[PDB]
Amino acid sequence: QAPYLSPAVPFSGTIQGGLQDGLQITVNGTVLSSSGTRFAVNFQTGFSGNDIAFHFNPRFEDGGYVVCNTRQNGSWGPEERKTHMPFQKGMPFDLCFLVQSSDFKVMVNGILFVQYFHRVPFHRVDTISVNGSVQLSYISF
Numbered sequence: 334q335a336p337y338l339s340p341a342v343p344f345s346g347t348i349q350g351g352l353q354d355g356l357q358i359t360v361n362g363t364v365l366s367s368s369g370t371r372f373a374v375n376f377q378t379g380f381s382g383n384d385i386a387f388h389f390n391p392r393f394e395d396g397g398y399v400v401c402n403t404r405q406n407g408s409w410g411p412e413e414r415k416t417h418m419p420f421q422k423g424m425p426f427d428l429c430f431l432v433q434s435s436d437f438k439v440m441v442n443g444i445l446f447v448q449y450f451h452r453v454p455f456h457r458v459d460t461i462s463v464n465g466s467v468q469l470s471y472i473s474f
């Protein structure tokens with residue numbers, strides 16, 4: 334699939350073919366300095382953000398941590414929290430999501446950061462959405 338170049342945030346874009354085992358999705362952008370304390374990348378079903386298979390949610394709060402969660406029919410599940418922050422306000426990042434049979438493997442600037450075990454079927458995902466305190470250079474596949 335051709336990349337999305339400099340899309341405005343908040344952004345929502347189709348993942349052509351849906352999520353597939355071995356698919357790699359890169360989000361390349363910059364964390365904003367004066368526009369809040371959180372962003373998220375959502376792997377979701379269509380345009381209701383009510384069904385989000387994987388919400389990846391860095392928070393520049395409390396020393397910095399990342400929330401990983403799933404939303405179903407509007408309701409957020411129990412969070413998994415990673416109490417390390419690999420991003421920095423005002424710095425560019427390369428964020429890579431690799432779909433695997435049982436989990437997502439998430440890399441930041443080339444280094445494995447977290448794995449998120451599938452809670453819902455990943456083949457149901459057809460949309461990536463990004464919002465909060467970031468600007469995007471590209472999303473690629």
Ligand SMILES: CC(=O)N[C@H]1[C@@H](O[C@H]2[C@@H](O)[C@@H](CO)O[C@@H](O[C@@H]3[C@@H](O)[C@H](O)O[C@H](CO)[C@@H]3O)[C@@H]2NC(C)=O)O[C@H](CO)[C@H](O)[C@@H]1O
Pocket residue numbers: 371372373388390400402409412464465
């Ligand atoms: C960045 C983003 O996508 N924000 C939208 C999203 O925000 C939710 C979501 O990140 C869930 C994930 O579990 O967490 C909510 O945060 C709360 C805390 O603020 C709360 O006080 O503690 C809770 C744990 O006990 C939880 O972590 C977060 N909500 C808010 C208000 O920030 O979804 C929202 C709608 O639910 C809204 O769309 C945000 O914009």
